[PDB]
Symmetry: C5
Subunit: 237 residues, 5 copies
C-alpha cells in the first residue's frame, strides 16, 4: 500500500521530531554504526504495517535534528513503533522534540468550488528528489467555527485560488488534527524552491481566512527529505 | 466492585499524573531495571485497597511523556502519598514529573434543566473495549462564561450535549471539576477505539457557542492508550 | 510572639518552592541523612529571628516537592536564610522553582463595608492539623487601578459577601506583593476540605472582580502542611 | 583621585548594563580552598577594569528567582562592558556561572521634565535616601504602540502626572532610568535603591493608578529584587 | 567581487545561527580545546567559495548567547550542511543551538512607489567602520497589515523610510524575507559604531504608523560585536 498510504483517506499521519544528545558523540564510531544498522533494521521490520519518511532538521530547524513522517492505519502501531525506535541504543540518546497526529480525509469545502478549479487540483505537484520540506501546524480561531458552511467554503476558495499556481513547484498534504493534540490542522509541503513556497505563503497571508489562524506555525518545521541511511551516516562519522 | 464506586460516584477526587523516563535509566544494567519494576508492581498492590490506579502508555503519542496515571481517591493526601512513594522507588527516581491535574467528580449542574428526552439518552455511557485510546483535555473557561446566568449557561451546555450525544456510542467520557486545585476549571477524559469519531466529536463541539468561552483548550492535549502497568514497564527491561 | 508574625502588619512573607534533582538519589543513604540533618539544624538556628513553615508539594503540584512559607520583619534575614539553605548539601540538589514576596497590611476596602460584614470578617477559619494549603498569586489589570475607591470597595464587598460563609472550613491570609515581584497579591489558604475551597473559588469567579484578574494562579500551588523532618525523612530512604 | 566614578552614575551618554548570573550546583563540589582562590581571581579582574568601567554588585540569591548575582555596569562603550563580562565569565568562578539576563540602556537628557512647572523641577533636584547595603530593584519596561502614536504634549502631561505621584517617595527611594530601545526587547530600564521596601511598594501602587500605566505593555518580567553589597561579601558566601 | 555578490544581490538565502558554550567544556584540557578550535577553523576554510560566514561575539551583550554566525548562501542545503558539520565538531559538540532564522534577500517592493527624491537618498551604503556592533531584529507583521492594499502599505513604508533615512549616517542595514521558513516575516540586520543613533533610530520608528502592525518585535533582540572567528574562539582556549 505504498501508493495507498500517501494518498488515501482514513490514514493517520504523525510527525515526530528528535534532538540528539551530546553524549551520543562520546560513543565510538564503530558503536554508532552498529546503532545505525539497528535502526535501519527496526524500520524494515515495521514495513508493510507502516510507512516512514525521514527529514533532516539539524541546521534548519531550531532544537531538532531529525524528523519522522509516519503514516499508519491505527495510531497504536505508530505508538509502538516510536517507543521501539526510542528504545534503540540510538533512540536512548534522543530527546523527543515534538509530536503531532492528524488523519487524512476527503475535502469538505472543495465540492462547492468551480469545475475549472477542481481541474487544476488534479495535478499532484513537481518532479524532484531530496526536496526541502516544511511542516506548519495550525489552530483556527473560534470565530472561524462560528461561521456557516457557505462562508467558510468561499474563504477556502480564495485560499485555493491564491495557491493553485504554486502547485507548479509545491506538493501539499493536509491532515485533520483536531482532538488528537493542540491544533486543528497539520500542513505539509515539499519543494525544491523555497522562494516559491515563501511567496506562496505570503499570498495566503493576504486572503481573508488568514486572520482566523490563531496559531500559525510555532513551530514552523523546516527540513530536507532524505533516506534514513544518509541521515544516520551523518550521526556516525 | 469498589472500582465502579470511584469511577462513577460523586465526591471522588481524580488525579492525572504524567511521567517521562530519564536517559540515565538505560546506562543501568538490564537486570537492575527489571528488579526496580517489581518494586512498583508491589507498591500498587499495596495501595490497591485505598485507591484505584489506571495506567496509560503515552510514549509515542504524547510529547515529553512516556507514562500516565489516573488515580481515583476520596482524599488527595492518599493520592499524594502514593505518588511521592511511587517517585521514591528506584524506578520513580529516574522519572521527571511531566504534569499533574486534580479534579473532583460532582453532581451535574445543568443536566436537570434539559429536556426529559435528552436525559434518557444520557444514561448510555460510551463503549466497552480493551486497550482503548484515552484522551485528556483540561479546560479553563473565560470570565465572560462565569458572568452569565444559569439559563444562559444551561442552554449552551444543552447545545453542547446535543452535538455530542451521537458520539456517546463509541466514546466514554468523564468530567472533573478542577477549579481551585490547579490552573484549570475542568478536566475532561475520554476513552475510544475510534479516534476519528472522537475527532469529529471535537469539531462538532467547536461549532456550538460554548467553545468561544474555552480560554484554555488542551495545553496539553494528552493522547495515550490504556494498558496494564506491566506491559509498559516490560518495555523498560529490554 | 511566634504568632505575632502570622497576624501583624509590616511582616514580609516569602514563598519558596523547590524541586529535587535526580542525582540526589545517585548519592549514598549516608550522605543524604547527613545532608538532611544539616538542613534541620540550619532552620533551628534561624528559629528566633524568623518563622518558617514547610509544605509537601510532591505529588500535588507539578515540578515541586517542598515549599517554605517564611515570615520575617525584613526581607534581608529571609534572603540570608534562603541563600544558606540553598548552600547546604541538600540545597545543592534543589532547583529553585519559584519565589514570591509580599508584605501584610491593614485592609484597604474593609472599613467601607457594612457593620454586619465586619463582624463576620473578624471570625477565623477552622483550626486543623497538617491541612491542605493553596497559594494563588494575582495580577490585577490596569483597568482595576483606574477605578475609583468607591468602585473598588463595592467590588471587594461583593467578593467578601460571597466568601464569608466559607470561613467555616477555610483559613486565609493575603500579602501585598506589588513592586517586589511580578504580582500584586499573594493569597494563601489552609483547609481540611478541598471541595469547599473549590466551591469557594467558583463563587468568586462569578463576582464582577474576577474579570480583572489578568493573572490567576500560574502557578496554583497545592500542598499539604507538614513538619520539615517528615518531609526530608522521605528523601533519606 | 576619582571624580569620574560619579561621572558615570550621573552623566549622560553613559551605557549602563544589568547582568545576572546563576551559579552551577557543581560549584559547591569544589574545595573551599579552590573557591577562595577563584574569588580573588575575580576580585583582581574587577580592580583591573576599575579604570575603564564602574561596577556594582548585588546579591539576588534568595530574593530573585533563578539568580544569585547581579552586576550593574556603567561604561562609555558597551564593548568595554562586553569584554569585562566575557572575561568575568572566563574566571574559574565565571566558568561555573550561567548568564541569567542582560539589559542595556543609555542615560539621557530628560525629554518631558522641561515642559513641567518650575516647582516640579525643583523637587526633582531633591536626592534619594542615603543608605549602606540598601535593597535594589530593577524593572524593565516596554511601552505599547499606543504610547508612541501620541504626540509629545500628551506624553509630557502623562509623565508629569507620573512625576507628581512619585515625588514624595524621593525621600526614601533613589532612582535612575536608562533608555534601552533597540538594545534589547524593552524601552526602558528602571533602577531603584531603598532601605524601605514598603514605601517602594506604595510608590509603585500609586503609579499603577495614573494613566501612563495602561501603556506599559511589559512591566517587570522579570522584576529583579536584590540587595546592594560590596563584591567581596558576595564572593565570601560562595566559598564559606 | 563574490563578497559583495552575496551581501547585496537577490536570490541569496541568509541564515542567523546562535550558540551557547556548555560549561563541561572548561573541564576539558587546554590541549584538547586548541585542537578542537583548529577543527572549526579549517571547516570554515573548506566551505569558503561556496558560502559566506561572518561571526559575532554575543557573549556579554546577549543573554544565553556567546556566538552568532551570519551565513549567506544561494541554497539553504549548503547552509544546513555547513551547520551540521560545525555542530558535529569537538567544539560544536559542546554548543547548544540557541536559535535559527532563515530569510532570502529580495529586490524592493515599495521603493518604486516612493518619490524620485526618496530613491536618491537611499543609494547611500552606510558608514565606514571595522568591528562595529551588530543588531538583529526578527519581525512578524499582524494580519491587519496583510489585509491592507498595496497603496496603503507603500505609504506606511514611505513614512518608515522617511523617518529612517537620516540614520544611514551611522547605520548599515539589510533586510531578509523570512515568511514560511520560520515563525517570522522579516529579519532585520544592522551594523553601527554608534549605538545611541541606532537607539534613536528605533525610537523614531516606533512613532510611525507601520510600527503598530509589528506583532512581534525582537524576541529575541540580538546584540553583538562583529569579529573574525579566531578571536572569538581564542577566548575559549585560555
Ligand atoms: C499549493 C498550495 C495549496 C493548495 C492547492 C491548497 C488548497 C487547499 C484546499 C483545496 C483546501 C480545502 C480542503 C478541504 O476542503 O478541507 C485547503 C484547506 C486548507 N489549507 Fe491549503 N492549500 C495550499 C496551501 C496551503 C498553505 C501554504 C497553508 C498554511 C500554511 C494551507 C492551510 C490550509 C488549512 C489550515 C486548510 C483547512 C482549513 C479548514 O478546513 O477550515 N494551505 N487547502
Ligand atoms: C462526547 C460526549 C459528551 C457528552 C454526552 C457531553 C455532555 C455533557 C454534559 C451532559 C455536561 C453536564 C455538565 C453539568 O451538568 O454540570 C457536560 C459538561 C461539560 N463538558 Fe461535555 N459532553 C461530551 C463531550 C465533551 C467534550 C469532547 C468536551 C471537551 C473537549 C467536553 C467538555 C465539557 C466541559 C468543560 C463541561 C463543564 C461545563 C461547565 O460547567 O462549564 N464535553 N458535558
Ligand atoms: C474565606 C475566603 C475569603 C475571604 C473572607 C476574603 C475576603 C477578603 C477581604 C475582606 C478582602 C479585603 C482586603 C482589603 O480591603 O484590603 C480581600 C482581598 C482580596 N482577596 Fe479575598 N477573600 C477570600 C477568598 C479569596 C480568594 C479565594 C481569593 C483568590 C483566589 C481572594 C483574592 C483576594 C485578592 C486578590 C484581594 C486583594 C484585593 C485588592 O486589593 O484588589 N480572596 N479578601
Ligand atoms: C520614585 C520616584 C520617581 C520619580 C521622581 C520619577 C520621575 C520621573 C521623571 C521626572 C521622568 C522624566 C524623564 C524624562 O523626561 O525622560 C520619568 C520617566 C520615566 N519613569 Fe519615573 N519616576 C519615579 C519612579 C518610577 C517608577 C517606580 C517607575 C516604574 C516602575 C518609573 C518609570 C519611568 C519610565 C519607564 C520613564 C520613561 C519616560 C517615558 O515613560 O517615556 N518611574 N520618571
Ligand atoms: C536605519 C535605516 C533604515 C532604512 C533606510 C530602512 C528602509 C526600508 C525600506 C525602504 C524598506 C522597504 C523596501 C521596499 O520598499 O521593498 C524597509 C523594509 C522593512 N524595514 Fe526598514 N529601514 C531602516 C531601518 C529599519 C529598522 C531599524 C527596522 C526595525 C527595527 C526596520 C524594519 C523594517 C521591516 C519590518 C521591513 C519590511 C517591510 C515590508 O516589506 O513589509 N527598518 N526598510
Amino acid at each position: 500500500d505504498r501508493e495507498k498510504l500517501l494518498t488515501e483517506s482514513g490514514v493517520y499521519g504523525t510527525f515526530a521530531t528528535f534532538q540528539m544528545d551530546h553524549d551520543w558523540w562520546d560513543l565510538p564510531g564503530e558503536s554508532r554504526v552498529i546503532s545505525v544498522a539497528e535502526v535501519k533494521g527496526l524500520v524494515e521490520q515495521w514495513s508493510g504495517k507502516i510507512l516512514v519518511e525521514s527529514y533532516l532538521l539539524r541546521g534548519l530547524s531550531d532544537h531538532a535534528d531529525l524528523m519522522f513522517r509516519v503514516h499508519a492505519r491505527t495510531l497504536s502501531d505508530t505508538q509502538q513503533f516510536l517507543s521501539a525506535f526510542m528504545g534503540t541504543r540510538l533512540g536512548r540518546h534522543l530527546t523527543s522534540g515534538g509530536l503531532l497526529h492528524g488523519v487524512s480525509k476527503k475535502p469538505t469545502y472543495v465540492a462547492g468550488f468551480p469545475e475549472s478549479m477542481k481541474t487544476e487540483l488534479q495535478v499532484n505537484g513537481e518532479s524532484g528528489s531530496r526536496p526541502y520540506a516544511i511542516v506548519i501546524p495550525i489552530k483556527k480561531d473560534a470565530e472561524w467555527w462560528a461561521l456557516d458552511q457557505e462562508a467558510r467554503t468561499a474563504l477556502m476558495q480564495e485560499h485555493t485560488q491564491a495557491a493553485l499556481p504554486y502547485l507548479k513547484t509545491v506538493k501539499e498534504k493536509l491532515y485533520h488534527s483536531t482532538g488528537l493534540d493542540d491544533v486543528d490542522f497539520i500542513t505539509y509541503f515539499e519543494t525544491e524552491r523555497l522562494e516559491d513556497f515563501h511567496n506562496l505563503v505570503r499570498a495566503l497571508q493576504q486572503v481573508k481566512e488568514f486572520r482566523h489562524n490563531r496559531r500559525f506555525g510555532h513551530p514552523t518545521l523546516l527540513g530536507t527529505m532524505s533516506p534514513l541511511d544518509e541521515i544516520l551516516e551523518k550521526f556516525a562519522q
